[PDB]
Structure formats: structure tokens, C-alpha cells
Design a protein around this nucleic acid. Structure first.
Lengths: 292, 296
DNA sequence: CAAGGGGTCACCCCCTT
DNA sequence: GAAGGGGGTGACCCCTTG
């Protein structure tokens, strides 16, 4: 309520965006919003609230860590500087800003240390801070380099409202986005079930199903058969990691249905679920016919 | 065979399966096995000297896939070898057979390659000019390299076994003809692996066809692959499985429909073979049996 | 260790509109 | 033709089992 503030209208896509190295190019596509699909494209959006008037909103990459420190990666795009800082303006009509050419520069573990000290030199600006105390600033990097996840970043939106003259000096409280997992990292993809040869079985179980999927980790996968409504009953499909073919298929058997006194058939859901990730695949329906 | 004394490969190297290793990876990662080997019976590349009993030294070096055999960029690293990549064994008058059981293949870096290449060259024609060489052949030798670095397949090597019979002197200086092995494809080399049918969800059907089969395979390129249903002895009746490139899942499965049998209104089930075939090329999977049943 | 496997980092190219 | 995706390739780095 009380005061002007910033809000993320549309969060960045948590999974599916690929980070890029310097060599790959400058133009490989922008980080979409969480509702991007089809030709209906969306981008990360924020708006200023409890204020109408000229403002500039900036964006920078910060860590997964809850105390937000600046990330080793940079943002590149049409709006952006070389510092990794993307900035947009909002006119007095429209206080909402879309960021539509946002890209994530992936630093090399070689490059990391050097490139980090340049971004760090900024907080030496705030407090003609004599280069004498560079050694004080450094060890932060040296240990930030061991604890810092390069598979995950978050966006930090910092809004500023224009003064009459000596403009855009008045700051709003900053707003941190949801985490953004590099798509090119291992458990960073969406589990998708592409196709399966069977969508029905006997209440008995032990019908063999060939399931086609996108990349799945050999022993980090399982096959959950669950009922949302009926008292959380669940079971699993039984297979050895040998039955994971080339990380794109699973041959398994069905688990028996909890109630085998079935008279009429019962539709169920089955999904893929990482054993440590926790995150499931988009679920598919499976039907169970009674003993005859 | 040719009457005078000669060398024979008793057991060839594994053609498809063996992984080449970089300098970094480590020096004991496995030995190049033989074409007979399995998890239980392990066998290693073996050769024998024939039409001669006595002391002899057999050496082995990597040469190109190219029929004119030139020295390969890769080296052999082993409990038996030189730094130059040349492994030697001695065979006394009783035993004229040499097994090589710790043979491994050093993969050179494309940055290392050209320099490393000219060492094996100087080392070859340094024995004909044993005091020094000429700037003329230095630059000439580089030229021979440059042209070999253009055309040398690093995914394939062959072994070149060269025997020597020891004279009265004490010198193993009497040379036999060299014998070149069948080619050795890097397991971890791009593309063109042996096609394998891992398993299939259906092994039967109807004469009609149009029965949906999920086939699990090793890496296949969507457009350039097919699924051949043939009767090998019966005048080559053949058909194909029915699928779009969209139906080839992540290059490691194929969902297809079975082709109709050539002759309907049979009364007894006809068992046939099906295989994968790079139609661009001519390659084929280990065939699998498929049964066709009578109508209703 | 040795004997086999994976995955990974960067970079490099390949499709499509 | 670049934009906007996606896949593949070398060199390297690891991890189980004994």
C-alpha cells in the first residue's frame, strides 16, 4: 500500500532458456516470460505502481543466493550497456516495461575471476575509493567463485523516478525475479512424455509399456502412478536403469491398482518424476480394466 | 600362401567398439581387445610368424585407413611401447605367436597434430640421413604433413605388424613383409555407428499390416533411415515400415506401422526378418524375426 | 590401481522464418 | 540474409566396480 513500488507483471521462464558464450554470437533470441508459447510471445514485464510519470527501470543479473549479490554472467541486448545492465524508460501514460531482447552471457571458469573484479570495482566507486584497498575487495570473489551457481540466475529490477533536473536519481525498492535455470544444464529441462505404446492395462499390473521421453537421467528417473482425487494412493513402474535406452525411452511394467475388486474401469495419471529433482513431467492418463 | 617366411594376424582387433584416449584422460583406461572377445572370454590382437622357428621381434604401429599405408597421427601407449608409438614383442623358438593385451590408442589434439606428425616423419627418414638433415627436406617434410593433416581420418586407424628375424650377429635385422589389420573405428567418433535393434514392443501382427511398433535402436538419422521387412531365401520379397521422420524419436526410437504381407489368405503364420537400412548407404541392423498371422 | 563408463565445458555449426 | 532457435563436435573431467 503506502508509497510507490515495483512489481513483476510477468516472471521470466524458470526452465528452457539457454545461456550463451561470447563465441556463439550476440543474437540467439531473448529470454521469454513464463507464459511464452506459439506466436503469442511474452517477455519479462514489470510495472511501477502508486506513481505515474517519467522513470527508468534497469535490470541486472544476481545470484540464486537470497542475499542478492551481482552475478558473474552479464545481460546482453539492444537496450543494454557493456556492464551487463539493461535499462528501459516508462512514459507518464505507461508505467509497464517489457524486456524482449534479454540474453544471458555465460562466462568461462577461466574468465570468471577477472571479469568478476571489474563488476566488483563498482562498489569501490560509491564509497574515489582509492585502488589501495583492492585486496580487501578481492577475497569475496575468490570465495564467491566456489559457491556461485552458474546454472541459475535471477533478475533484479531497479526502478528510478526522474527529479525535475539532476533527473532519475530517486530510487524505488528493488524487486527480485524467480530463478532462471540454464536449459543446457542437466536437470534444467522440462520432463516431457512424448508418446507411450500403452494407455491401458489390467488391475493386476505387470503390463509392459514403452515410454518415449525427452532427456532423462538414468537412475534419477522414476514413473509415478497417482490419483489426485482418491486419497493420494500412488505406486510406481518397475524397471532397472538398463531399461533406460539412450536417455530417451523407458521400458517398464505397470504397478497393480490399489483396488482390485474393480467392476468398472478407473482412469489414473502417470508421470515421470526425478528422484532428487522432485519435479514431475506433464502427466498422461492411464486406464485399468477389472479381472475377467 | 607365399613359400618363404611370413606373418599372419591370428586374431584381428575389434573393428567397432574401442575408445581412443587423450593425453589428459589417463594411460590405463583399457586395452584394445580382439574380434572374438566378450565380458567372459577376453581376447587380444594376436599374430604368428609362419614357416620359421627361432628368435624374432614383432613390432606394431598405427597407420592410416588409406590403402597406401602411411604413419598415423595417433600413437600406441602400452607397457610394451616406445614414445614414438611403437610396441615390440619378442618370440623365442618355441612360441612364434605374439599377443598384445595392453594396447591403447592415444588421440592427438588437432593443435598438437601437425607438430606431432612431423616427428614421426623425421623419425622415419632420419636413418637414411643419420648425421643431419637439410632445410630443403625440413620444409619438404612439413609439406608432406600439411597434405596428410587435410585427409587423415582420426576416427579410424589400422595396426601394422612388422616382424624381424635375428641373424647370427645378434641384430633382429632380417625383415618380413608387414601385415595390416582390419580398420579400427573410434567408439567415440562422430556418427555412422553399427545399427542395433535393442528391442521392439511387438513381434507379431496381421498380414494386413498397419500394426504400430515401437522399436528402440542406436543412433539413427531421421530421413536417411528405413525399416526393411524381407524374406531372404524366398526370392527377396521385401516391404517397408510406415513412418514419417517426425516418428523417429530423438534418433533412438522409431514408431512405425507394419507393411502388408505380400500374400494374404494364408492359413499358417509366416515368420520374416526386419532390419534397419541407411538407404543413403547400404548398412543393416542385426535382423529380428517378425510373425504375420492369418486374417480373423 | 585398472578397466570401463559417463558427463561437462566451451565452441562450432545446423536447421528454420 | 540475419534473427531465433537447436543440435553436434572436440578435448577434458570424472564415477563406478573390482
Amino acid at each position: 500500500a503506502d508509497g510507490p513500488y515495483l512489481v513483476i507483471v510477468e516472471q521470466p521462464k524458470q526452465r528452457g532458456f539457454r545461456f550463451r558464450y561470447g563465441c556463439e554470437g550476440p543474437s540467439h533470441g531473448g529470454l521469454p516470460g513464463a507464459s511464452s508459447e506459439k506466436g503469442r510471445k511474452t517477455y519479462p514485464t514489470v510495472k511501477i505502481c502508486n506513481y505515474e510519470g517519467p522513470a527508468k527501470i534497469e535490470v541486472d543479473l544476481v545470484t540464486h543466493s537470497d542475499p542478492p549479490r551481482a552475478h558473474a554472467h552479464s545481460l546482453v541486448g539492444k537496450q543494454c550497456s557493456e556492464l551487463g545492465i539493461c535499462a528501459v524508460s516508462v512514459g507518464p501514460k505507461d508505467m509497464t516495461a517489457q524486456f524482449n531482447n534479454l540474453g544471458v552471457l555465460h562466462v568461462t571458469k577461466k574468465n570468471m575471476m577477472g571479469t568478476m573484479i571489474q563488476k566488483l570495482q563498482r562498489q569501490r566507486l560509491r564509497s574515489g575509493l582509492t585502488e589501495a584497498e583492492q585486496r580487501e575487495l578481492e577475497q569475496e570473489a575468490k570465495e564467491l567463485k566456489k559457491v556461485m551457481d552458474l546454472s541459475i540466475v535471477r533478475l533484479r529490477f531497479s526502478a528510478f523516478l526522474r527529479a525535475s533536473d539532476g533527473s532519475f536519481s530517486l530510487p524505488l525498492k528493488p524487486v527480485i525475479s524467480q530463478p532462471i535455470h540454464d536449459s543446457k544444464s542437466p536437470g534444467a529441462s522440462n520432463l516431457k512424455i512424448s508418446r507411450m505404446d500403452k494407455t491401458a492395462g489390467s488391475v493386476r499390473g505387470g503390463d509392459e509399456v514403452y515410454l518415449l521421453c525427452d532427456k532423462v537421467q538414468k537412475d534419477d528417473i522414476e514413473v509415478r502412478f497417482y490419483e489426485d482425487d482418491e486419497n493420494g494412493w500412488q505406486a510406481f513402474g518397475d524397471f532397472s536403469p538398463t531399461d533406460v535406452h539412450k536417455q530417451y525411452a523407458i521400458v517398464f511394467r505397470t504397478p497393480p491398482y490399489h483396488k482390485m475388486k474393480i467392476e468398472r474401469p478407473v482412469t489414473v495419471f502417470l508421470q515421470l518424476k526425478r528422484k532428487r529433482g522432485g519435479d514431475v513431467s506433464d502427466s498422461k492418463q492411464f486406464t485399468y480394466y477389472p479381472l475377467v
